[PDB]
Amino acid sequence: MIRRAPTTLQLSHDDVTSLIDDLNEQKLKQQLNIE
Amino acid sequence: SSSSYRDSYFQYRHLPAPHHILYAEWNQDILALPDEVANITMAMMTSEQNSNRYWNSFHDEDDWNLFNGMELESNGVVTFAGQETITGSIFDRRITQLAYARNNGWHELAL
Amino acid sequence: KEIMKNLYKINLSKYINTEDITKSNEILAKDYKLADNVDVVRSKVDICYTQCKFNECLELCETVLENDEFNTNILPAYIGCLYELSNKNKLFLLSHRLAETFPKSAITWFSVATYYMSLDRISEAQKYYSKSSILDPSFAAAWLGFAHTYALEGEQDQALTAYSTASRFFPGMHLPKLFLGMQFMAMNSLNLAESYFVLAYDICPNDPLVLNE
Amino acid sequence: DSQDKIIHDIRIQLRKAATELSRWKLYGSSKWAAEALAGLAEAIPQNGFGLSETEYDLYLLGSTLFDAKEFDRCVFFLKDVTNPYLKFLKLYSKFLSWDKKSQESMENILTTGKFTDQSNISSILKEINTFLESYEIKIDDDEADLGLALLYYLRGVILKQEKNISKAMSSFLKSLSCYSFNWSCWLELMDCLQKVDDALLLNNYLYQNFQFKFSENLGSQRTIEFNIMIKFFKLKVFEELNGQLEDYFEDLEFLLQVFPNFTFLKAYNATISYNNLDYVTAESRFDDIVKQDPYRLNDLETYSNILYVMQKNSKLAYLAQFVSQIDRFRPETCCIIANYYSARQEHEKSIMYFRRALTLDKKTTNAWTLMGHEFVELSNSHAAIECYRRAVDICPRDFKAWFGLGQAYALLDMHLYSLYYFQKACTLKPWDRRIWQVLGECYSKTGNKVEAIKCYKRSIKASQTVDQNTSIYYRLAQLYEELEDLQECKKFMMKCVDVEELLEGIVTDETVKARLWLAIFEIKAGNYQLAYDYAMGVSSGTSQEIEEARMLARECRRHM
């Protein structure tokens, strides 16, 4: 009797792309305040 | 600077002959694994059957006969080949004995 | 009374208060002459395998196999520990040695099949798990490995039936229920996976695998 | 009683032997000394050196720059020292600097030697002679330290490499007399020996007019009869040269008692079984070495040599994978794998490892003949001829090389051109059936029937078992048939047939032709009854054999 690797999940594409989009929001709005 | 004063890794003085570094490629040689790769020399799917036959040689005659065409399906229902068929579910001791019976046993319709 | 109590307690199942078993076998080791007997080292091997102390697997198993080369009580744990360590050469020697002596027993063919397993030969090792299962019923190792051969590479549909057979024919073990639930999870079907996981947790309360799942 | 006292003497001495020799950074004997003590039978540190604190500072500089491979730098700082203990270190640093440099200079050069069979080396020799005269002992005195004895070892080895034999031997004896238990010194002494008669000359000298300095050596050890190196000398020189044995048995069992766990003896003990063509027992002997000592790439070349003849490719594949994992730079580790690769009919790769195995250590001339063989299976006779020919040029007394070179011509049609090579191999091992039979075939194929007759008769006597003479008898009878005298060949036809009866009916192929021919001639003799049984006895041969006798049986039965 042998156990395989237990199921583990990493960062998906959807959530990482959402974080990328958010990063663009706070890298887009602040320079308007500077300007 | 300071180069030879550190000794925390494999260095040029740890191996016996400093000139062995000239070759320095024998470390990166994959030695042929024991059994099935011997089949590629003749060739210069077949290797797996060869390894299967080699490991199949360790049977008794009656045991080999039973496993000669043996196929096991996923749900546990078992198919037995008569050299009739004995399709029955596994993990019950009786079916196997029955398979042995009509294998080596004597059956005669006698008109 | 005390020596027989310890002797029986050696063989109890793990996952529950293993410290008590450790203390009992330590008491049995020094006080009495039973210091390095077969069952005490077998219990140590079972303990290390449960806690994945695979190094101790190999030392204790080698130190016991050097006396008895064919002790069937320890061979399953020994094979699992070596498979985890992927000692291909040692496994080939063991498989060959058991092939010349015990062709009938399912342990030999399970060993040969896991030798194929370690070389990534799932499709071929399928047949050899089938042979090991046929030669000896009521053997969790053979059928569970056979289900692993189904589940590892494609053909997902009937791995479900294989694991259901494992659960029904081998009641009382949380492992088949856990495997079936995880496979349903692999299908992205959720409620059934949760149901099988809670079933496995019911069978076994203390197991990192089931709680992680 | 006294044996235990001897046991009590050896560990302390071997503690001393491994101490200074390792302390003086020579590993030829230091590695062996600790090995010997480890295998010794179960029954405060010891150190001493006459060095001043001023000069002892140079020792640490000298010693540490030695193993750091900077031999030349060690010489420069240790130039002005005058102590004999340090004077050895400077010249030893000087000598090994040349030896290491020479190895780098030639790596493409496989063959080593001079075809007819200095000044930089002669520079080293002068400091030894100049320093030896200046120092106020110059051996032959009771108060002779280890360093001066150790100095003579360097003088001997530097003399040998200049091919000044018969002077290094005397120097080696002087060094061993003042200090025994120096294996590297003994090995250089064994090397200069060339023939067995030379060994008897040195052995006598070791017994009557040789004695150790009892002051330096511990008591109960300077006696020649209770020494150990003299014993280890007996086991070494007497068998590698395969010389006539004397005072060898009683010593061998004496060393097995004192050294039951010594790894070197068992491998040597296993090698003795190897040298006598006793393969089955040697395998059991070797199996203890691997189990007891799994990492020893010193005598395993014979182990993988045993396995190749034994067949069992799965085991060889196991050994090849296991040995290669330790390291791939030993001379042996590159010969074991090639054997594994040869069994798999992969020749273009196996041929590679033999050339590799020889390059690491050019002294392993046994790989030359194997590399030649590996060309023959490649259907490349031209390349094989050179590979065999180098082997005899390293040392003309190689029976393996001559035989392997003789066959390569015999495979081709050049039968007579191979006769000289086979003749040369005859002198090496005359007492062999295999070689003599081959010589007979060459004479038979060259129209020398008068000589081939005498050649086969010699082969018959050398054969240990009668059954091996079955094949020769039939061919020998044929040659008489070519020498138009049918009566003479009958007697040999009786013997070859009679061997079948003496072997409870062996019924072999070359006797089948004997009975068919014998029955045919008996028909011409008019004795049908004596011919009838011959056909019946051969009725269990080939398809054509049985029918030939069956029709002959009918012919003789009618006239019976």
Order of helices and strands of chain C: HHHHHHHHHHHHH
Can you summarize the main beta sheet of chain C? none
Which chain pair shows the most residues in contact? B-C, 23 and 24 residues
So what's the oligomer here? Answer: part of a larger assembly
- How would you name the CATH homologous superfamily of the domain at 1-367 in chain D? Tetratricopeptide repeat domain
Provide the β-strand percentage band of chain D.
under 5%
Measured distance between first and last alpha carbons of chain D: 84 Å
Distance between the termini of chain C: 42 Å
Helix percent band of chain C: over 70%
User: Compute the gyration radius of chain C: what is it?
Assistant: 18 Å
Q: Judging from the principal axes of the Cα atoms, what is the shape of chain D? A: elongated
Overall structural class of chain C, as computed from helix and strand content, comes to mainly alpha
Question: What's a concise summary of this model?
Answer:
The structure is cut from a larger assembly and holds chains A (35 residues), B (111 residues), C (213 residues) and D (560 residues). Chain B is mainly alpha-helical and 111 residues long. Chain B has four helices and three strands; from the N terminus they run αααβββα.
Report on the structure:
- The structure is cut from a larger assembly and holds chains A (35 residues), B (111 residues), C (213 residues) and D (560 residues).
- By secondary structure, chain A is mainly alpha-helical.
- Chain A contains 2 helices and no strands.
- Chain B has 111 residues and is mainly α.
- Chain B is built from 4 helices and 3 strands.
- The radius of gyration of chain B is 29 Å and the shape is elongated.
- Chain C is an all-alpha fold and 213 residues long.
- Chain D has a domain at 1-367: Alpha Horseshoe (Serine Threonine Protein Phosphatase 5, Tetratricopeptide repeat).
- Chain D is 69% helix and 0% strand.
- The relative contact order of chain D is 0.04.
- Chains B and C meet through helix 2 of B and helix 6, helix 8 and helix 10 of C.
Which features would summarize this protein structure in a list?
part of a larger assembly; 4 chains; A: 35 residues; mainly alpha; rod-shaped; B: 111 residues; 4 helices; 32% helix; 6% strand; repeat (chain D); ubl conjugation pathway (chain D); centromere (chain D); cell cycle (chain D); chromosome (chain D)
Topology (SSEs and partners):
This is part of a larger assembly, with chains A (35 residues), B (111 residues), C (213 residues) and D (560 residues).
Chain B: H1 38-43, H2 46-56, H3 61-66, E1 71-72, E2 77-79, E3 88-89, H4 93-104
Antiparallel strand pairs in B: 1-2, 2-3
Chain C: H1 2-10, H2 18-31, H3 38-50, H4 54-65, H5 75-85, H6 88-101, H7 106-118, H8 122-135, H9 140-152, H10 156-169, H11 174-186, H12 191-203, H13 208-212
Helix pairs in contact in C: 1-2, 3-4, 4-5, 5-7, 6-7, 7-8, 8-9, 9-10, 10-11, 11-12
Chain D: H1 2-23, H2 27-38, H3 53-67, H4 71-77, H5 84-105, H6 119-134, H7 146-160, H8 168-178, H9 183-192, H10 196-207, H11 229-240, H12 249-258, H13 263-275, H14 279-292, H15 300-310, H16 313-326, H17 333-343, H18 347-360, H19 366-376, H20 381-394, H21 399-411, H22 419-428, H23 433-445, H24 449-462, H25 470-482, H26 486-502, H27 509-524, H28 528-537, H29 543-559
Helix pairs in contact in D: 1-2, 3-4, 3-5, 4-5, 5-6, 5-7, 6-7, 7-8, 8-9, 13-14, 15-17, 16-17, 17-18, 18-19, 19-20, 19-21, 20-21, 21-22, 22-23, 23-24, 24-25, 25-26, 26-27, 27-28, 27-29, 28-29
Pathway (chain B): Protein modification; protein ubiquitination
Protein name (chain B): Anaphase-promoting complex subunit SWM1
Organism (chain B): Saccharomyces cerevisiae (strain ATCC 204508 / S288c) (Baker's yeast)
